[PDB]
Design a protein around this ligand. Structure first.
Ligand code: SF4
Lengths: 286, 289
């Protein structure tokens, strides 16, 4: 039956590009898939639909008067391989809450029968900069049972993974939301692969796939498309199919073990990302 | 007469380093200052205190029962130049709202008379990666009158500048809160100064200063310090004394004119940041060439 997944991770490490490339690979294997974009920039569907910007549920609602008058056809678009795409829309600057926006989007999709239409998979594309109650809404309301965290071998992306893990610990007694694994979006940095496997081991999960950097991703991105669609023969295309294969097959759903800031520094030093701090020069004029 | 300011801007562009270097020059120049860190990392005070991490109000309250069981001395620490320091602390991951925490920290500091104590400036350091109702708390509740925006000549920094400006508009209508200027944190990107001068004009504001890239900032950072403390004769110190002098003298406080997404992208393209899109290759497979 339909699996409900979310991809969570920091901004500016290519999470949405990895999400759309994975979803493309899943359509190619013959799964029927929906992407529900929950990023405030609303950038989670452009490579499926070949568009500059999909009209969001917030925008279309606040324009049809309210969500009550909105037609599913203005909001749900089909793109590469029949993948169905919808955007939440981010909060209204200075007043909104992403928790309220995501609930509106989901409640609206249920009501119109989106979740029932032959779907194998739904992927919530969600921001993990700050893991407040708003961005955790898909977890609190038991909508994303299988979470995959995009990170990279850098402090802030790994801190965002840890905080996402703590969001999953909080809802543990409540429902069935589980961490299914980490995805490492490569930044070309030494031992990044080994850093994310070790972080996975300490979190009690797996690194499910290492996504390499390859120029073919940007060649496809400039054309508003996925690699699967642009160049089905590319080495990079086989890397997205492999990750799709491991996600379809995946049974390792856990409640993770969040680590301390001291244990995070310890992995980042051990893997050559961070240096010994020389406590001796602290507070001292030149 | 105490001036209540907020520095808003996206993460990963050096915002908190610029803020602390600005507060450090103001203290060097006779001013009594308080920094209220509002970033979830709670990174707004380390270079003032030469400290690894300042205890946050959220962490202390939860361990001490509630915020009512805290004393001022455990929360407000003084560092370089008499500069008073406080970290709100960020939301409990998965449950909390950043605004709930920032409002709890601000009521506690008023209640303990920390705003009456011979103060020239309060500076809130606020993350602008998403301008929800939470991170606008200092603006919705009339605590910050003058907002300055750190950006850089990068797409996401300037998208953040524009959403922060729309946040000011929502409250400036029916409030005294105003936009005081853009501060460019250089990334040594070509024509950055011009891009931010142009964005400032389109918004109705000024580019109050351009902060260059200088390796002497990391020399100081590495020792947990501001450049004014680490080497006042440095060229980069006068940069921070100039930005300070302009904030002290500033009388340009505006309701901004936010720009559309198209008007912003045409800026990025007019100054060589964003590439012009070739519409003829959109949707074209390699097999179609
Ligand atoms: S919960 Fe998170 S998103 Fe909602 S308002 Fe508070 S901070 Fe913003």
């Amino acid at each position: 039956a339909m699996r409900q997944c979310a991809i969570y991770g920091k901004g500016g490490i290519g999470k949405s590009t990895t999400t759309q490339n994975l979803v493309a690979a899943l359509a190619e294997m013959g799964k029927k898939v929906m992407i529900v974009g929950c990023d405030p920039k609303a950038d989670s569907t452009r490579l499926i639909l070949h568009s500059k910007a999909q009209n969001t549920i917030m925008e279309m609602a606040a324009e049809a008067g309210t969500v009550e008058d909105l037609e599913l056809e203005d909001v749900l678009k089909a793109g590469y391989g029949g993948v169905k795409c919808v955007e939440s829309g981010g909060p209204e600057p200075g007043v909104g809450c992403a928790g309220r926006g995501v609930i509106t989007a989901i409640n609206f999709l249920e009501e119109e029968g989106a979740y029932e239409d032959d779907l194998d998979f739904v992927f919530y594309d969600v921001l993990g900069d700050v893991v407040c109650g708003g961005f955790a809404m898909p977890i609190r309301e038991n909508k994303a049972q299988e979470i995959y965290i995009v990170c990279s071998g850098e402090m802030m992306a790994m801190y965002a993974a840890n905080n996402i893990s703590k969001g999953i610990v909080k809802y543990a007694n409540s429902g069935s939301v589980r961490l299914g694994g980490l995805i490492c979006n490569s930044r070309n940095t030494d031992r990044e692969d080994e850093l994310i496997i070790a972080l996975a081991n300490k979190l009690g999960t797996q690194m499910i796939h290492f996504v390499p950097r390859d120029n073919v991703v940007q060649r496809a991105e400039i054309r508003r498309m996925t690699v699967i669609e642009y160049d089905p023969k590319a080495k990079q295309a086989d890397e997205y199919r492999a990750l799709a294969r491991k996600v379809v097959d995946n049974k390792l759903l856990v409640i993770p073990n969040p680590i301390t800031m001291d244990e995070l520094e310890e992995l980042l030093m051990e893997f050559g990302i961070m240096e010994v701090e020389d406590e001796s020069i602290v507070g001292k004029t030149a």
